[PDB]
Design a protein around this ligand. Structure first.
Ligand SMILES: [Ca+2]
Ligand SMILES: [Mn+2]
Length: 207
């Protein structure tokens, strides 16, 4: 059900017939998988996918959905960088499964909006600004979670749903950050703690 010709894998990521593997259950990884064709952010974008964050609550580090206007070879840092940190220009929705000192004010596994490769929630809230991270409780439960991301190119808003629940919204024009065209894809990282991490894209609608 995945067409491997449409996806470009970097680092420790791999393309499988039914999933995009971001990290294996091993230390120090970074992986990214980009879709081969950019999207037009002067039109609406809806992305729905299942996310698997692992079966170890004491594991790490998490995944992103990322929009970025560089191209299909990009790979961000390992560990708490989630395979994303350092990528710019970009907007990411992270599902973060390890609390770093820079993760305040998160207190559990959390979902957050990051900008231009910055994974520090207080810096982003002071600079852009981005919303506070939203605590999910433990999502390293060995289950697939449904994530939906909605960009509205008329209101200039982003919504994020997790297991059917509205979790984050934002009113920044992301096209003023990354431009009107972007590649989309997924990243993950592991560090001194680890988890098997993957996504299963379900639906992408642009306009
Ligand atoms: Ca983290
Ligand atoms: Mn975080």
């Amino acid at each position: 059900p995945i067409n491997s010709s449409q996806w470009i894998a970097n680092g420790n990521a791999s393309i499988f017939p039914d999933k995009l593997l971001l990290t294996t259950d091993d230390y120090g990884e970074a992986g990214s998988v980009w879709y081969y064709k950019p999207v037009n952010l002067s039109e609406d974008l809806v992305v729905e996918f299942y996310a698997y964050l692992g079966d170890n609550p004491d594991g790490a580090d998490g995944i992103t959905f990322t929009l970025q206007s560089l191209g299909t070879n990009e790979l961000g840092g390992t560990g708490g960088d989630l395979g994303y940190g350092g990528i710019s220009p970009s907007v990411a929705v992270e599902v973060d499964t390890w609390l770093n000192d820079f993760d305040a004010p998160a207190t559990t596994d959390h979902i957050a909006i990051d900008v231009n490769g910055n994974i520090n929630h207080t810096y982003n809230s002071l600079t852009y600004p981005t919303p506070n991270p939203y605590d999910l409780g433990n999502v390293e439960d060995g289950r697939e979670h449904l994530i939906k991301i909605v960009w509205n190119a008329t209101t200039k808003t982003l919504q994020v749903y997790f297991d059917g629940n509205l979790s984050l919204t934002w009113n920044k024009d992301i096209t003023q950050i990354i431009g009107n065209s972007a590649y989309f894809g997924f990243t993950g990282g592991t560090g001194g703690a680890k988890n098997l991490q993957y996504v299963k894209p379900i639906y992408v609608k642009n306009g």
